[PDB]
Structure 1
Amino acid sequence: PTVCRVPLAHTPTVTKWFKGITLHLTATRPTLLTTRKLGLRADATAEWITGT
């Protein structure tokens, strides 16, 4: 076991509207966007995002 230096992606911009958000994501390389709701149902998502 050891420690590796991993990249930090560009912090996304959040557009706020009624009962939702928009993430404006910049990723030069495949990056993972994971979401989940904090209630009885998760509705979890997973995506590898490349590009803006």
Structure 2
Amino acid sequence: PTVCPVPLAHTPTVTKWFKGITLHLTAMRPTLLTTRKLGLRADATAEWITGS
């Protein structure tokens, strides 16, 4: 076991509609975006995103 440098992505811009958000994402190579809800149901998502 050791430590390796890993990249940090471009921080997205959030737009904040009513009872929701949209994330504007920039990605040259595939990076992973996951979400979940903090109540009884998580409604979890996961997707590798390339592009803007």
TM class by smaller structure: over 0.9
Aligned to 2:51, the other structure's residue is in SS state coil
Aligned to 1:40: 40
* CA positional deviation for 1:3: 0.2
TM-score by length of 2: 0.98
* CA positional deviation for 1:35: 0.2
* CA positional deviation for 1:26: 0.2
Alpha-carbon RMSD: 0.3
Determine the C-alpha separation between the residues in 2 that align with 1:8 and 1:21: 22
* CA positional deviation for 1:29: 0.4
Determine the C-alpha separation between the residues in 1 that align with 2:6 and 2:39: 31
TM-score by length of 1: 0.98
What is the percent sequence identity of the aligned residues? Answer: 94
Unaligned runs of 5+ residues in structure 1 are none
Unaligned runs of 5+ residues in structure 2 are none
Determine the C-alpha separation between the residues in 2 that align with 1:29 and 1:15: 24
Paired positions, count = 52
Determine the C-alpha separation between the residues in 2 that align with 1:9 and 1:34: 14
